[PDB]
Amino acid sequence: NRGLYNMVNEYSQRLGGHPATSNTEVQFVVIAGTDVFLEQPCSFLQEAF
Amino acid sequence: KIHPGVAMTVVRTDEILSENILFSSRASTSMFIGTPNVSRREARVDAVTF
Amino acid sequence: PLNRRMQYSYYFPVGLFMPNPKYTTSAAIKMLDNPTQQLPVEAWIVNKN
Amino acid sequence: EGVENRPFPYLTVDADLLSNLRQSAAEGLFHSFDLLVGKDAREAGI
Amino acid sequence: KFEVLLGVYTNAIQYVRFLETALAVSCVNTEFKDLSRMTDGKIQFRISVPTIAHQRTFIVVKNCHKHHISTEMELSMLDLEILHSIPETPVEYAEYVGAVKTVASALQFGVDALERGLINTVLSVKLRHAPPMFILQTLA
Amino acid sequence: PTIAHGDGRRPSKQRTFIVVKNCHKHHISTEMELSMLDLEILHSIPETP
Amino acid sequence: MDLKVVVSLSSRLYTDEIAKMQQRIGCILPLASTHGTQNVQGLGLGQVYSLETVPDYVSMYNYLSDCTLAVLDEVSVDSLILTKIVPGQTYAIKNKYQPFFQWHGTGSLSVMPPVFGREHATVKLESNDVDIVFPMVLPTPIAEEVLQKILLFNVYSRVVVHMHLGSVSYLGHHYELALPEVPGPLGLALLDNLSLYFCIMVTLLPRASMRLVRGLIRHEHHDLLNLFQEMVPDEIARIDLDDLSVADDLSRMRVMMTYLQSLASLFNLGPRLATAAYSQETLTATCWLR
Amino acid sequence: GPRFTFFQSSRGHCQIMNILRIYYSPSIMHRYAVVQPLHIEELTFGAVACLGTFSATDGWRRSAFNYRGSSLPVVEIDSFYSNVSDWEVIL
């Protein structure tokens, strides 16, 4: 909610909007960050298609 | 949600931010450029404002 | 200064009524209603988005 | 803020640094900045 | 151990002369040194209109219209009292140089804002006499 | 810089930003192994083929 | 110090409006900002005093104390110039006001919303489609008389004597002034604060002075006493029945003089001009802002 | 107990006592409701005084004042022209 360019740097820098894991049979919540590269537009604009 | 005995024609205004193009022909306007004279408005107690 | 904001005007009727010799210039619209006894009550408008 | 307001041999470059700057800095793109308007826009005393 | 200061930088504020852009192709310019003493300026047009055998002259007047523009630079009383005085010690010379750079940069900023406001007033008065395209497509 | 304006507006008296940029410092570490068996023979000199 | 505000009109100006404005050179005009150049909107008292039937004088006072003040010296076509009045400088203010109030030698001037009509002190500018009206500048006692006449018509409105109140009287001439009907919430808030002041006056007022004036009306007749018509009011009778004590009187006067200074400052609305050496032959006065 | 407040305004003294009476409008009836002014001297609701003028544009930039232990917020009026005045009572 606060800032707009700092929202962009929050999007790009560490990107923890609590995403799911990958290459597992069922998705867990990822804890170890910046090992699997993710990108979350849904955690930026809060919608769903 | 039944219809009343009358209708309405909803008028509204929609603002559109455009990107204009201004053309102007050669020598359309003769202008005189003055002299940039400098002055002193206010001697405020720490800063003077020119 | 050039990036100006022209504003137009839009208008549309809500809840009009066709005259009694009704008709249709379509094929693939079938409404489960008596067609000679239907009139609108709302108007649908498409938004900016 | 970590910005030092000291005088400096400011190297003058020609790139258009202030391309949509005030609306960027008011929203806080930079981690730590300082805006000096008016009488504070000078060199500081040594 | 040390903290490194990897060079300071600043923008070299390029002065934008009114003739250095192509907006001056629209307008012929004359340095008139006494516009404060010009209360009015008019132009007569005698347009002789010929006829067609199967006589009119439309005397029209156009008047000038002045445009006063002025920003406000601001300078502290610190870098004037230290400016008028004479430096003796080299730290006061390094201070006096910074003070005169501040004052000269503010004055150069002032004339730069004036030469930008000139382009702004030219661009505005070229809008004030500019009807839109869909009218003059038919009117011409 | 600013623009001197004809209308009476609140004039921005010589705005100047002083921004800084901190460096990003991060190190890279490889871990190259080297056996001591082909290292103890590196000190001597050969005399037999 | 350079005090010169050039106000560029956004359009031209005809010769009749030029000749009407040129008569009002030297009259005080208010301004929107204090900057170098200004547009014509915000100039004058016309933005708060619209072209309507209903005035509101106290809102024009609240405007006038808020805005700055300037004097009109040069008017041309497409642009007119003004000279600001900043405190600390000394100005020559000419008496170019049509209801001619004669000015006192080293008295005190006082600016004022236009009490003698909209059409009287105005210039009609159809060319820039706005109106510049001119605030009245009159001396401070006649200004107090006008202000109290306005408040007295505001309080006597639910009673009714009209022309005995709705017309100011000066030695040069007596003048009629425009009387509105309701000042809205602001004039009533001014009357509210003055009602607080008056009611707390009739709380803490001393009683020995009533005991003076009750016997004094019975003793002496004066022009300070003729308005009672040799009839002591009944409140003097039903308050003077108590005794007299000097200690409570000195306790009462230490709040009386404490409140009367603030009551005096409840009539300092609108900025005040301190003048000096007004010549009656050139109609100008070396004056500065107080 | 009494309070020492500070008010910044861009208006006149005639405006400032009216708007300060309006600002203190709950507090006067508060002090009246908890304590009846039984004597004549308790009527005064304090006074105000103009401390001087400053520029209305870059006035009152907020800053902080640090002691060794703590830090409170404090306003920082810059380029003040000090000019005291006598006390004008509020009622």
Q: What residues of chain C, 30 to 49, have a C-beta less than 8 Å from chain B?
A: 39-43
How many alpha carbons lie under 13 Å from residue E69 in its C-beta half-sphere? 24
Inter-CA distances, E133 with C2, E121, G101, G280, Å: 14, 22, 59, 63
3-state SS, residue G26: coil
Q: Do residues E13 and E109 make contact, with C-beta atoms less than 8 angstroms apart?
A: yes
Check H80 against B45: CB less than 8 A apart.
yes
**F7 touches G: beta carbon within 8 Å:** yes
Other C-beta atoms lying within 10 Å of the C-beta of residue F8:
22
Instruction: Quote the tokens at residue G252.
Output: 């009462």
Spell out the residues 6+ positions from residue G258 whose beta carbon is closer than 8 angstroms to its own: H44, H89
Distance (Å) from the C-alpha of residue D41 to the closest C-alpha of chain B?
Answer: 11
Q: Is G184 helix (H, G, I), strand (E, B) or coil?
A: helix
Q: Are strands G122-125 and G130-133 parallel, antiparallel or unpaired?
A: antiparallel
| H or E segment to which residue A7 belongs | helix A5-12
Cβ of F3 within 8 Å of Cβ of E71? The answer is yes
Question: Is residue C16 a contact partner of residue C40, using CB atoms and an 8 Å limit?
Answer: yes
* Resolution in angstrom units: 4.3
CB atoms within 10 A of CB A46: 8
List A19's β-bridge partners, or say none.
none
- Cα–Cα distance measured from residue H60 to residue H9, given in angstroms and rounded to the nearest whole number: 11
How many Å lie between the alpha carbon of D38 and the closest alpha carbon of chain B?
Answer: 8
- The values of phi and psi at residue H75, to 5°, are -80, 155
Residues of B in contact with H80 (CB under 8 A): 45
Question: Chain D contacts of B47, Cβ < 8 Å?
Answer: 38-39
The pairing of strands G272-276 and E48-49 is unpaired
Structure tokens at G114: 């236009």
Report yes or no: H78 at the B interface, CB cutoff 8 Å: yes
Residues pairing with G124 in the sheet: G131
Structure-token pair, residue E48: 């002789």
H or E element, residue G198: helix G184-204
C-alpha distance from residue G283 to each of D14, G96, G106, G286 (Å): 61, 8, 13, 10
Strand partners, G72: G82
Q: CB C36: neighbour CB atoms within 10 A?
A: 8
> Which experimental approach was used here?
cryo-EM
Q: Which residues contact G88 (CB under 8 A, 6 or more apart)?
A: G288
With 0-12 CB in 10 A as exposed, 13-18 as middle and 19+ as buried, what is F11?
A: buried
Q: Which residue's structure tokens are 């309006």?
A: H22
D4, D41, D42, E89 from D35: Cα distances, Å: 12, 8, 12, 31
Cβ burial of E52 (10 Å; 0-12, 13-18, 19+) is: exposed
Give the burial string for E85-111 (b: 16+ CB within 10 Å, else e): eeeeeeeeeebbebbeebbebbeebbe
Residues H22-61 as b or e (16 or more Cβ within 10 Å = b): eebeeeeeeeeeeeeeeeeeebeeeebeebeebbeebeee
Task: Give the residue among B32, F9, G72 at the shortest CA–CA distance from E36.
Answer: B32
Q: Which residues of F touch E (CB under 8 A)?
A: 1-6, 11, 13-14, 23
d(CA G149, CA G178) in angstroms, rounded, equals 11
CB distance F14 to F1 below 8 Å: no
∠ CA B12-B17-B19, nearest 5°, is 145
Taking only Cα atoms into account, the Rg of chain H, rounded to an integer number of angstroms, comes to 17
CB environment D14-34: b (16+ within 10 A), e (fewer): eeeeeeebeebbeebbbeebb
Least Cα separation, residue H48 to chain G (angstroms): 10
CA pair distance G186, G184, nearest whole angstrom: 6
Element (H, E) at C7: strand C5-14
Count Cβ atoms within 10 A of the Cβ of residue G61 and give its class: 0-12 exposed, 13-18 middle, 19 or more buried: buried
Task: Give yes or no for a contact between F3 and E121, defined as CB atoms under 8 angstroms apart.
Answer: no
Q: Which residues face E28 on adjacent strands? A: B30
State how far Cα B40 lies from the chain centre: 29
Q: Which helix (H) or strand (E) holds H27?
A: helix H13-34
Contacts of G84 (CB under 8 A, 6+ apart): G3, G4, G5, G31, G34, G68, G69, G70
Which residues pair with residue G80 across a beta bridge?
G7, G75
Among G164, G161, G157, which Cα is nearest to G183's? G157
The residue type of G81 is I
Chains in touch with D (≥3 Cβ pairs < 8 A): A, B, E, F, H
CA distance G89 to chain B (A): 12
CA distance G21 to G218: 59
Nearest residue to G77 via CA among H86, A46, B23, E66: E66
Chains C and E share 3 or more Cβ pairs within 8 Å: yes
Q: CA–CA separation, A7 vs A27, rounded Å?
A: 26
Run of H or E including G185: helix G184-204
Report helix, strand and coil shares of chain G as percent, to nearest 5.
35, 20, 40
Helix (H) or strand (E) holding F17: strand F15-19
Beta-carbon neighbour count of residue G278 at 10 Å?
21
CB contact under 8 A, D27 and A9: no
For E14, G118, G241, the CA distances from G128, given in Å and listed in that order, are 38, 18, 69
In angstroms, the CA G283 to CA G96 distance is 8
H80 touching B, CB under 8 A? yes
Query: What does the block give as tokens for F35?
Result: 């056996």
CA separation for the pair G288, G89 (Å, rounded): 6
Per the CB < 8 A criterion, the answer to whether F6 and E114 are in contact is: no
> Rounded CA gap, E110 and G97, in Å?
40
Name residues 121-140 of chain E within 8 A of C (Cβ).
123-124, 127
Give the three-class secondary structure for E115. Answer: helix
Among the listed residues G122, G45, G114, G36, the one whose alpha carbon sits nearest the alpha carbon of residue G81: G36
∠ at Cα C42 (C39, C47), nearest 5°?
Answer: 140
Using a CB–CB cutoff of 8 Å, tell me whether E120 touches chain C: yes
For residue B33, give how far its alpha carbon lies from the nearest alpha carbon of chain D (Å). Answer: 28
What's the CA gap between G146 and G258, in Å, rounded?
26
Alpha-carbon distance values, C30 to C20, C24, C27, C35 (Å): 19, 11, 8, 10
- DSSP, collapsed to helix, strand or coil, labels residue G75 as strand
Helix or strand holding residue G247 (H, E): helix G246-264
User: Could you give the 3-state DSSP secondary structure of residue G20?
Assistant: helix
- Each residue of G13-33: b (16+ CB within 10 Å) or e? beeebeeebeebebbbbbbbb
Do the chains contact at F19 and D2, CB–CB below 8 Å? no
Cα G290 versus chain centre, distance: 15
Residue of B nearest to E124 (CA): B22
Q: How many helices (H) and strands (E) does chain C have?
A: 0, 1
How far CA G101 is from CA of E80, G95, G110, G142, G268, in Å, comes to 47, 9, 12, 9, 20
Cβ-proximal residues to G133 (8 Å cutoff; 6+ apart), any chain? G44, G45, G46, G49, G114, G118, G121, G122, G123
Contact C12 B22 (CB under 8 A): no
β-bridge partners, B17 = C5
| Residue H41, helix vs strand vs coil | helix
The answer to whether the CB of G22 falls within 8 A of the CB of G76 is no
> Among all chains, which residue has been given the structure tokens 């559109």?
B16
- Residue E23 has a CB neighbour count (10 Å cut-off) of 16
Tokens of residue C1, six digits? 């200064």
Interface test with D, best of F17, F21, F23 (most D CBs within 10 A): F17
Closest-CA residue in chain E for C6? E132
Contacts of G244 (CB under 8 A, 6+ apart): G207, G208, G211
- Does D44 reach chain F within 8 Å, measured CB to CB? no
Burial class (CB in 10 A: 0-12, 13-18, 19+), H21: middle
* Cβ-based neighbour number of residue H3 at 10 Å: 6
- What is each CA distance from H75 to E46, G51, H7, in whole angstroms? 68, 43, 12
G119 and G136 Cβ atoms separated by less than 8 Å: no
**Tokens 């930008």 belong to which residue?**
E116
| Burial of residue G286 (number of CB atoms within 10 Å: 0-12, 13-18, 19+) | middle
Confirm if B26 and E27 have CB atoms less than 8 A apart.
no
Q: CA E9 to CA A18: how far, in whole Å?
A: 40
Q: Is B12 helix (H, G, I), strand (E, B) or coil?
A: strand
